[PDB]
């Protein structure tokens, strides 16, 4: 067949044309699949071997079944990632190879109960949750510093302020630092079609601060498309799991202390102001250190000024080069 070769050449010729073009958008994949084993890919052998919780960068549009994307990993080449509908088609393909998929068990019962496939045996049912396989996440993951105690107080603000200035000086002319005052942990997507569409409704959520929450999320989305590195100074974040289910899912950077004895003497050097709230600062470190380390993106166990700074420097630099 010449049509398959021609469409292979035409699609391939378009590939290098978009190699040096700006990134359009980006989503996240929470399922394990390979784009090279599939026989419906326009180009065979140039698929993507991605895994669960990965990132991709779409740049153009091809069809309703395939998309052109670049891996977030360093050295990412041109690859094809299945469309949300295409992934659904192969999603049904994975659990249809089994002997049965609906109610009728094959426990030595053949020829009696045919059990034609009902509505409950297809993907249109099970609409209790309906988690989307692809989530609209920012193209570049925002970096957030968390710990070691309550945010907005003397202890946490200043031990994170230094790292903001240290990163700003080295990334000057290419980075943007923004502080958000509105709550960000309430970044939900599947609560209602449009909660508080207008501010003049005078409803329960019209006069509350829920409306201000969403307005910042689209700004984060638009700031993500600017291609410039952005870090968040949100004071409403204290636990990684609070801001983990949301679409943004910022980079959780953990600062930890070797022993609580160091923490107790730390406030003692501050003064009489922070001893009153010292009771809750001890709890905050304890309820944050009991969280498993693997949830956190990175860890900062070093105590010195320099080794704590440059350790995160190469991590962000390798990510910066990996995106492009």
């Amino acid at each position: 067949e010449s049509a398959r070769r021609e469409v292979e050449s035409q699609a391939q010729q378009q590939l290098e044309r978009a190699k040096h073009k700006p990134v359009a958008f980006a989503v996240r994949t929470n399922v394990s699949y390979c784009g090279v084993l599939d026989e419906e890919c326009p180009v065979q052998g140039s698929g993507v071997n991605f895994e669960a919780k990965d990132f991709l960068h779409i740049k153009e549009k091809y069809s309703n079944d395939w998309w052109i994307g670049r891996l977030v990993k360093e050295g990412g080449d041109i690859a094809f990632i299945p469309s949300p509908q295409r992934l659904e088609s192969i999603r049904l393909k994975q659990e249809q190879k089994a002997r049965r998929s609906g109610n009728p068990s094959s426990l030595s019962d053949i020829g009696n109960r045919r059990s034609p496939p009902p509505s409950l045996a297809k993907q249109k049912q099970k609409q209790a949750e309906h988690v989307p396989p692809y989530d609209v996440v920012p193209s570049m993951r925002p970096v957030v510093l968390v710990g070691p105690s309550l945010k907005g107080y003397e202890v946490t603000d200043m031990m994170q302020k230094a790292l903001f200035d240290f990163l700003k000086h080295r990334f000057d002319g290419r980075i943007s630092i923004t502080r958000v005052t509105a709550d960000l942990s309430l970044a939900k997507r599947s609560v209602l079609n449009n909660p508080g569409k207008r501010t003049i409704i005078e409803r329960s959520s019209a006069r509350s601060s829920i409306a201000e929450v969403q307005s910042e999320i689209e700004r984060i989305f638009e700031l993500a498309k600017s291609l410039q590195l952005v870090v968040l100074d949100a004071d409403t974040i204290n636990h990684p799991a609070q801001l983990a289910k949301t679409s943004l899912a910022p980079i959780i950077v953990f600062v930890k202390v070797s022993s609580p004895k160091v923490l107790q003497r730390l406030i003692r050097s501050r003064g009489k102001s922070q001893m009153k709230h010292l009771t809750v600062q001890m709890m905050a470190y304890d309820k944050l250190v009991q969280c498993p380390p693997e949830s956190f993106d990175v860890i900062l166990d070093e105590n010195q000024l320099e080794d704590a700074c440059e350790h995160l420097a190469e991590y962000l630099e390798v990510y910066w080069r990996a995106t492009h």
Binding site: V262, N303, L305
Partner: peptide
Amino acid sequence: DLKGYLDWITQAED
């Protein structure tokens, strides 16, 4: 530890 922890806690703000 307090050598490198008290030096980081001072120059950042004060």
